[PDB]
Design a protein around this ligand. Sequence first.
Ligand code: ATP
Ligand code: ATP
Ligand code: MG
Ligand code: MG
Ligand code: ZN
Ligand code: ZN
Lengths: 398, 398
Amino acid sequence: KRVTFKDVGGAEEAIEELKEVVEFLKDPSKFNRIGARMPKGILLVGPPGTGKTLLARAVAGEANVPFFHISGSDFVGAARVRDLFAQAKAHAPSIVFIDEIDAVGREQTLNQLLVEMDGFDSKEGIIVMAATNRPDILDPALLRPGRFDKKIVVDPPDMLGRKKILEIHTRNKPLAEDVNLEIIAKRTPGFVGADLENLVNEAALLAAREGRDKITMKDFEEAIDRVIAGPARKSLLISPAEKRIIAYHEAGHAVVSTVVPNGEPVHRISIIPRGYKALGYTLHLPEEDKYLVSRNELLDKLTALLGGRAAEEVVFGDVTSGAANDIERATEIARNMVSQLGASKIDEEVKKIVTNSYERAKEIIRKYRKQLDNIVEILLEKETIEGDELRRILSEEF
Amino acid sequence: KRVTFKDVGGAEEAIEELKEVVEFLKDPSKFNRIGARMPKGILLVGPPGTGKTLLARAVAGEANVPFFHISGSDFVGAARVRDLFAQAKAHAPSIVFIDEIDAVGREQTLNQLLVEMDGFDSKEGIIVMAATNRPDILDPALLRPGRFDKKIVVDPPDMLGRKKILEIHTRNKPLAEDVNLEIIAKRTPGFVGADLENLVNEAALLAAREGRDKITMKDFEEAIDRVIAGPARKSLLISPAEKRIIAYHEAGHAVVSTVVPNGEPVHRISIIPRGYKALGYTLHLPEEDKYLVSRNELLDKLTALLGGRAAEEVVFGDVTSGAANDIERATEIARNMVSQLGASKIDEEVKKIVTNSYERAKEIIRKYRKQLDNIVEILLEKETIEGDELRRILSEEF
Ligand SMILES: Nc1ncnc2c1ncn2[C@@H]1O[C@H](COP(=O)(O)OP(=O)(O)OP(=O)(O)O)[C@@H](O)[C@H]1O
Ligand SMILES: Nc1ncnc2c1ncn2[C@@H]1O[C@H](COP(=O)(O)OP(=O)(O)OP(=O)(O)O)[C@@H](O)[C@H]1O
Ligand SMILES: [Mg+2]
Ligand SMILES: [Mg+2]
Ligand SMILES: [Zn+2]
Ligand SMILES: [Zn+2]
């Protein structure tokens, strides 16, 4: 089946990134005449079910060109790679797509892929795309210049994103007049596009089982219960009790950052992760992102990184998996600080730095408990605060 | 012989699940006109003698369609699978049934089955069904999307279920006026439908041996003794001494869950198992069923999982097979907790977590011994507590 960008919801930034690829595929001479050099490979990274394959297929739909694809889960291997690149060259304007590249990137197939990347001319309109959900186990040889060197992140949808996906999959189905898709979206936090597609099918089976020719509001609400429990369950959602722990953890990061003099400005607070760091990816990038290394700015960074864990212990006396990851990162930063700012005595010094920074964050939480509570109440009602509203809220408080 | 849903007793939930299949088989256009997509395969799981084959045969009776079936115990193999699917297509509205699929799911027959599943069109009213009592040894390739992906559980009958089965098999036999089928049902805990069918035949042989033309009450009571002992025995039943150990084990789970702050609500307590977890099935599903991983909720889950074993040691000083399984599951959860919340030193940490949780459960049992005794007395008289009665009982106590 053929798809375009009208079949994708909640991926505005990725579509903005891929507009350039579409334009290049439509007419390469415009890029060639001014000496603009396009990348040879593009990598898509994201959690399962977020729609990487759908985006790859929709890119070819917008600019109608041949689409040659292979899957890494099906891996004679070196000969199959050779044939794929030969078809693309005979139809110069086209796309080559490799799905699940982590399953193959045994050593003969990888070597053949590197030979093919260096052997084709990009000026005639050939691009290579790949997708994965385990980017941190890829061979470093694939990420050198002249190879896959552009990365695009795909994120789970928010409330307004979930509503758009529901409308895409119900435009060919008859609905009653009591159906409110906005209410349904508010009751499925944590769902991804694949989960929402399965939910619509379940509601249609309940109506057909009774002979009705329309789907009603109660069909949708009963379908939610059937997909989260039982011998055949497919989806997970965030319950109201779990929502309170997550809200306090996110607010703890923002409060501590605003108080320390060297902290970074806060632009968005949400219950759903959005960044590549929030998803737990390093992407083979150095941890240090500053030109200058100084003691005061490193200590402030450590204290803010422990704000989420400090809020959990002071309010609930508990610890989550996210908090355990945060203290693992902080130990790596402290180890690098000791060797740059001045075997068993080194460990004692690292343990002292982390312990002191954790106590500092806990005393900030206690002093600003009233401000922390106010942010949590607003977050539990809208699920996301950003833009001018966040600026005003942070100014009225503090 | 032809059967329908009137020949099945004590399987209300399975019949509710299969009503949709019956409706689809009767008229596919109603499902097609609104875009409702039916599953391609359905799997039935349960202990031997519970009536999986009977349910499969009764599905075809309610919607009179051709019924093509094969048995896995009779396994040239690839050619027999090819012929079975060819007959169904020529009679589009029909059923294909594979019995004892674990005996075959040597590698050529399995490959042919996967080719047939992907080659037929579901929109014309074709469904595939299978049954097994060893679901945990099935090849994972059969459970992927587009293949067998819906599961239905069949459970042993309770007291009211046993009474219904006895009435089904005595409606064509002459009975005396002193026969009370309700009393007979109370004296056969642990029997399944196959056992009860054999019991009725035994009572009819005792009457015929004396030339009588009616079956009396004492014929039924003598038949029970003849099927549980001797060189030719067929059935097992729970004795009054064994009933007390089982009652204390089940009540131990419920008491501990109600006391810990993060425990789950209790809705039903019974002497007969009812769930797929209570039957010892994993069904290839992840153990973790929560969106968020936290320390406090994991420890509470571990303590409640050991409540049954703690009651046995404090009241009787004994251990059963069910208790041994419970402590085997708890060790797997503890191992995963250590690697997520923070080679020989890892084992010492796992052993410490399990030991601490077991001591916690034992001290709860001692403090609430009076409440534990009261629940056991009611359970030994009715065999099952649920609904509003359980809510009231749990509220008067505690
Ligand atoms: N943003 C979206 N809008 C609409 N449908 C979506 C979206 N994301 C996912 N889907 C639905 O999810 C279905 C399957 O997801 P898809 O295979 O595209 O995701 P993926 O990230 O490639 O998955 P995986 O990691 O499992 O390979 C698609 O057929 C599409 O119907
Ligand atoms: N719920 C029931 N109601 C009535 N009869 C039943 C019921 N369950 C089983 N039976 C009787 O059990 C007899 C044999 O059981 P059946 O073969 O249907 O069970 P099964 O689960 O397929 O067994 P197995 O695992 O041995 O293959 C059937 O002929 C039927 O008479
Ligand atoms: Mg994919
Ligand atoms: Mg059978
Ligand atoms: Zn955090
Ligand atoms: Zn138990």
